[model samples]
Target: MGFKLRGQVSELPFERVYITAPAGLTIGSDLERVISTHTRAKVVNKAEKSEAIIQIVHAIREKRILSLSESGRVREFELVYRVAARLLDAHNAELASLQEIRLTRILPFLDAQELAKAAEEEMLYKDMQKDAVQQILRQVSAFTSAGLEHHHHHH
Candidate 1:
């Protein structure tokens, strides 16, 4: 019988990561933090210096939905956070295609508790960022394995 490995071995995919986005939204910092922490990759400031370039686009929207509570009429709002990203190497080769990850959280708004509503909304938005980043990280990591295999087979 052959010895079998207990678990799969996965290496850090990218040597360095450079994150980018248009001027309106700010996601560069969040991406850098997660990539460096989980992947153990350097987050570089310039695309020219980094081995991986990640382009990201983010959008958030609020939608109104009607629902009845046990006591009375309650207003509900859906907060949707969307992130789209593409991975490229220093040569500008397509490592991973553009992918969008979206997350939504419900907000209960009432005539009361005005003081906490603003703070609660902020907290929700922060959590949404975390979810979006994690999804993007996993997507890129998965692609790296497949993409490298393809590149190697062609050589």
Candidate 2:
């Protein structure tokens, strides 16, 4: 619902920006915090009021599935977070595309089942932070650069 506003954005076109969250009670909620880290545009109290409108469609931790072990316990989990952001007019509310990312982390043996799960989730959340940042940047790029250009030679 909200957005963050910092980072090295030499590769991005919009340097400064103001964002508006949903109108719900928890309008600018936790989800905004997560999205802000990956975006360069500065989030403000009033984005809708701004002259420019940047649309980004996101689904945070949409689907989650943990694998159960034969020994009678869950061993690992696969999570999905989507980032499909793009430029647009104020009339629309969406990014434009999607990026499905799944990250699996194995947990260590612990007698306290709840403790183990808690720790594992915390670990995964941190990992997702970095992954989300890179993924969002990809969406902002003018186009995907196939490394082929980097390997080209004038000869």
Candidate 3:
């Protein structure tokens, strides 16, 4: 026989991935880019054709509170990016259960620089989105390395 033809095998359990986020949200495309580049997997348009699927549900929250600064009137605005994600295999099996990732950034509330603060807040949200993508990949890598990829069985 051909001695079970084998050479290099990809580490990821799945080769194709479909990413989805809540409707009206653009995070799905962001996830598609990150997952496609980092995992070396195809980001398919159809979930049925994908070997794995990722779902991300996201929300944003903001809070304003006084901070311990020299100026007693100084306040801070906290922005929270909350995400709940789930991973599934082609068979619709749960590869990773629902996981929540939350990232926050704070800005000094300067009424004088309201315009600058708004732009800064958008930047912070973008950073947190990247952070969330990285976190999801971390879980995927963990599962791939620890639980799956046991295809080598010496017979």
Candidate 4:
């Protein structure tokens, strides 16, 4: 008599980190290098080449996943948020409050509309880094809070 296989295949545990920054920061190369050196996983670039700093955060998250998978460890991964100088200053108080509410904070400052406009046009090469970082943090927080990996069988 042949036995029937009747069991559920559980999914692998994973975590995500979101990063954001202004156009000029470009932290991707550094992030990728550090993660590669420290962990045994592949870092993926989900953000476009134009958003290098954002890409760095993605790479870090990927590295975390890789490291976790290889080592069979469960840990909280970090999401590095790189904000532009101007935006941080523009919303200093609010940003600080947001940081206290959340785990990440924005950097730098720029309040002058004319300056911000100029930066957005000629100086800014990418999207608002702080905004991007916030978006990522919110999403990840929601996902994990929803119990993505609460009951997994360890093998």
Candidate 5:
């Protein structure tokens, strides 16, 4: 099956990336290391002609889902997560305008909700965000400096 990706951004034609969210996060740099260490891209000075731009449109840890899976029944779930971001191109044009890129996964209850003796122990968890960074990489790699980037074959 073939799908058309209308908007996207490169083999990572440029590795230099500039950031804009730290200015107001009061949340600190726990993410600084994540963005830098997770991808092949680098966070750089905007004045340096960086190839890509990074901005956190919204990043939040929402409410925890407790007791939804402990009823002793086995069920499957389609997990959905999204991150919003903004970006500017080398020509100083906006490519992404507070866009939300969503990802999905499957989660099962018996996988281990059994260990939670307290409501606090029922919290959710994940450790493979390297998957996310790789996804972001795919988007950035499809863009050219013109404006909105994309990957398509022209007739």
Candidate 6:
């Protein structure tokens, strides 16, 4: 009998533990802190590459993306990806950077109905955001792997 190794071997696990959103999440430094704490992820302010800024742009471009309706709210994945793309684009210093805007905090009283309505108008924008985030994650993984390979080559 021969023993064989199955699946690909990588240095780090692919799973990332994300933190839960705040009760009344609002955009701002406080929200950043919350995200940082939950994911053990770094939150940057005035971060041209920050995910928050990217989401904001997506929200603005596609108001429906911002909608909190049952269908719209289900599109969190879209929101996540958009942010990732924004960060990567900014980091690469592409054509231009998003305005370094700051969302102070999540409004506790923000009506869910209003959010849903917004999503209705920005459906395409929301989809784009989702695609961008997925692309960013793939890019990050490749970038990190390449850096590791280069470093090992030196030694």
lDDT of each prediction vs. the true structure?
0.68, 0.46, 0.67, 0.30, 0.50, 0.33
Give the number of the best model, judged by TM-score.
Answer: 1
Residues 56-142, candidate 6, lDDT per residue (tens digit)? 232222222333556544332222221312222333343322222211111222345788556643554434543443333333334
**Poorly placed runs, candidate 3 (over 4 Å):** 1-13, 61-63, 66-74, 147-155
- lDDT by residue (21-118, candidate 1, tens digit) is 77646567777778777775788777778877878655554555556667566667777765665677776677666566667888888667887697
TM-score of each: 0.73, 0.48, 0.72, 0.21, 0.49, 0.25
lDDT of 5 at 24: 60
lDDT of 6: 0.33
Clashes of each: 0, 2, 0, 7, 5, 21
CA RMSD for every model? 6.6, 9.7, 7.9, 20.5, 9.1, 14.1
**What are the per-residue Cα lDDT tens digits for candidate 3 across 36-63?**
6776678887877887777765645455
RMSD of candidate 3 to the true fold?
A: 7.9
Write model 2 residue lDDT over 1-155, tens digit each, in one string.
87867555424445344444333322134334533554444444555543335444443554354566786675554555544334443444443333333444444545668876677667766676566555444544433333122222222
Q: Candidate 4 regions off by >4 Å?
A: 1-117, 122-127, 147-155
lDDT of 5 by residue, 49-151 (tens): 6775666665543432333446755464445555565567655467565345555544454545555423222233242244454555555554443434543
Worst 10 residues of 4 by lDDT: 54-63
Question: What pairs collide in candidate 5?
Answer: 9-141, 9-142, 9-143, 10-141, 10-142
Candidate 1 vs candidate 6: the TM-score winner is 1
What is the TM-score of candidate 1? 0.73
